[PDB]
Design a protein around this nucleic acid. Sequence first.
RNA 1: GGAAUACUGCCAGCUGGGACUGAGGACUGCGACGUAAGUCAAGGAUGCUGGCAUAAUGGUUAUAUGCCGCCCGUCUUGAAACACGGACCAAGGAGUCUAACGUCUAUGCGAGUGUUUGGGUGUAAAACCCAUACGCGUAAUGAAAGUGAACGUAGGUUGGGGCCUCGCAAGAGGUGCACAAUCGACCGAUCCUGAUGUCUUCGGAUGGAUUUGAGUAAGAGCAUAGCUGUUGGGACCCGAAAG
RNA 2: AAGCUCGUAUCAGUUUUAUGAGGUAAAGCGAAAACUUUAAAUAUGUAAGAAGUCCUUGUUUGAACGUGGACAUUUGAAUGAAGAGCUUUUAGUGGGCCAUUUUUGGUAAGCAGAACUGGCGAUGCGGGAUGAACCGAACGUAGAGUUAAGGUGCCGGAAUACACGCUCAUCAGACACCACAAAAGGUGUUAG
RNA 3: GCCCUGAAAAUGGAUGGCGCUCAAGCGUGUUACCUAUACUCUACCGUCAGGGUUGAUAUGAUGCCCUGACGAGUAGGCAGG
Lengths: 122, 134, 51, 119, 37
Amino acid sequence: TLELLKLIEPYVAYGYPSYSTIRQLVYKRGFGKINKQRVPLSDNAIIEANLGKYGILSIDDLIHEIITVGPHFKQANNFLWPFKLSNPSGGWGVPRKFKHFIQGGSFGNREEFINKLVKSMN
Amino acid sequence: HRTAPKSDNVYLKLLVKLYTFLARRTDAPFNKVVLKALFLSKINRPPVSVSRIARALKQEGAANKTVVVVGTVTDDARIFEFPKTTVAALRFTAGARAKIVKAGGECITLDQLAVRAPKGQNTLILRGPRNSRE
Amino acid sequence: VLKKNPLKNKQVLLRLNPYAKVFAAEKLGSKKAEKTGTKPAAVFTETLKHD
Amino acid sequence: KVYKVGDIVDIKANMPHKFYQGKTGVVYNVTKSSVGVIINKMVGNRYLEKRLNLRVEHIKHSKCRQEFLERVKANAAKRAEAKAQGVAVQLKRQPAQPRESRIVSTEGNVPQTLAPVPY
Amino acid sequence: LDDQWLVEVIDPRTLNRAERKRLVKKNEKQQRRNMKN
RNA sequence: GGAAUACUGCCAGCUGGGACUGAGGACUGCGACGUAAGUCAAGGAUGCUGGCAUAAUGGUUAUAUGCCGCCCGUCUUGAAACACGGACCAAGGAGUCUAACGUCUAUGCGAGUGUUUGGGUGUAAAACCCAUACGCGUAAUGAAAGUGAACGUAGGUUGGGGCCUCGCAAGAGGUGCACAAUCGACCGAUCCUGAUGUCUUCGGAUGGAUUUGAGUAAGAGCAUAGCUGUUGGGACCCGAAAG
RNA sequence: AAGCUCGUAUCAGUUUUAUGAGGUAAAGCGAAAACUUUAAAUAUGUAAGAAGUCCUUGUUUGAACGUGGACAUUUGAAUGAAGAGCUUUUAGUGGGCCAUUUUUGGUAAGCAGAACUGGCGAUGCGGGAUGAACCGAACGUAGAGUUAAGGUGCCGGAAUACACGCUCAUCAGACACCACAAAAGGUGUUAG
RNA sequence: GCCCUGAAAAUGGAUGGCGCUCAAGCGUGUUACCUAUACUCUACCGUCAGGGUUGAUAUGAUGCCCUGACGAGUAGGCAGG
């Protein structure tokens, strides 16, 4: 995966998400994939009747599997539908956006400030 | 993979209605296949002689299996003995029908068949030859 | 018919995660931590302060 | 060392004639005068067969399936042993996982501060 | 052609050589004619 | 020596202001608070009050103001323009019919099929009835003379939809339509093998090695109609230098 | 388009792992760059299990041409997905510019040949005062919100904002560049 | 590093205009703000896909219900009017 990220560095802004942002992202934009139908979580039995095979039978079990990368993480991570975030609600914080985060831009690895950016994009 | 019969046969639409309901509420693959066949054009619905019906009843334990021809059941003056097993089909050319009955059979149609076997138990689905004309 | 956001809507927030009630009941978002008294090492102080 | 029709080969050299020079294709005719090879050449988005004769002075035998051989042995023998004495298998290859914590102790490795002076 | 390593088109190099042999033989036939006449 | 503040982060921390929206339309679910009756911010807005009831709101329209908007169609696709047509209005105005093949679909009957050249009859160019022929199809292959498709349960093999058997299923066995891959069988042509015998050149035996055929190996066609394709007729419409 | 044969444990403009080659050269140590072991990506190449895996004998110990027999799913790397396959079929299509990258040859200077990748055409929208190719950009009808590229004296929505330096031009500059006149002059100024 | 010479004609003239000089110029930093058919959420239309339903006592089965994603378009193609 690190090779994939190196390859698409110019077009993404990745980082290391923390517990709090994982939790809010999943309670707010958390939508599950069920028969290819982007069903919102909004429940427990929803998650349960698809991810019961892996013992994930709440939403905290799901957040747990995602954050403490687990044995069934591929299953959880493909159950979740790609979060569709809003534009950042404080601006991106730079005049021009397509430079590496290191050169005062926004793309590329951002090891720990991804939490701030994402909470704002939420 | 067309999803409606292009014919405006009142009776074909009644049969398609019956078999949509049966295929929707039985879960026995016989219904799925017989329905999918009820949508087939005339060059994909080829005729099954009574000879192939005889040659199929020749098989092992296929003595009392009724045979099911979604197309039509023509005749073959090139045989001289027919078994006495029930045959269900759409259309029965009068020669073949008289032959089946003279030997003693029964040319039930597809809805008498629906009653006699909803899941399709104990039945042979025969499809005629197709790659003749090219 | 309508997706109601947790992290507000306490009713939804407690429908999911039946634990949020004890969270708030013990005030676990503001829990202290005992006073550890491990003064550090001279070598570490050196290699920090010194050039 | 002699050839047979259909073994995945390599190529090499001992100039600017026709530079494939590195491709691994299948031989199709073990002839004395030459060896013919098929190449999968992409024309737009079209993998085509390119037939080309070569002289055997610049051709070596690829061995790219020897790894699969060795690992078939490894995995079959391992799962057989695991059926013999039952523990977890994990009989699949993994990508490099990230390292975990550790204490880097300075008792003799006191740190040394350097800048582009060079010194 | 009897030198390089691959040609990208029964080896065609030998065919090159035999074609040249037919050519020079045609030369020789049209020379034997000229020296007979 | 002991502090506070800053910075960074966390709260399923408290609290206030503003904007837009209110889709759905008996009940059912997940919850929560309460002992329980019940209640609730929990599968989408209700409660209270006011003004007017008609040009007040909304629609149409002329104009004003703010911002936007290069003239249409065609042919070159690049000065992507140039160039060519356009004064204005009404009516007319350009892929049609037919023959022959072919495709896909629908309908009738089905080893058949096709009544309409013609006869009979008639409420009269209609409808209704009909004999005998004839076409196509049910037999191929040969340059031609000609010969002309079962050793077997029309064949084993490998898949194969459906069904049967077992058990709850999974899975297992059984049979396997269509079709395909492969090896065999049969008919015709080709090369040999050459008889029983012969008016002595006619007759053509067994087997094999080849090849090959839209070949057989329990038939699928015939007719009508609709949509389309190609060719030919003036052939989408107007326009040429002529004999 | 239809037919039929799967809903593929199959595929993918992708990564990894393996082994390839071009090894440029940082190795370095050789006998005194002196080798030759070798290395990162530089950029391609084939391969990673169900018919696989084997166990048992007929064959010119080898290689297998024949069997028969075991290991269905920890059944063999990461990631994504259901649109994958094959027979019959049928309409339009054939012209051509710009840029980037790899590369061969060039001279007044342009440039010419390749190969690959975008874009343009069939394509609107925001910005660059205007515009074939420049910068953003997933076009149903509307509401609210937040931003990209570009901006915030006035035209013109948005700081005559804050902070550190520099410059005065007898037609500055706001340039677009990582181009041309461009090599120099100057008792202009600033820092080295 | 800014600055000045570092050549260029001919209707009147263009940093887009006005104008600007501790800038409204040049280099740079931190903020705040403005705005696209882009991104998020909601409502409506349509198409595609996945589920459900031919049972009275009431309908339109070519229907009715629930759920999700998507929507430029020439030559051509298909469908409903």
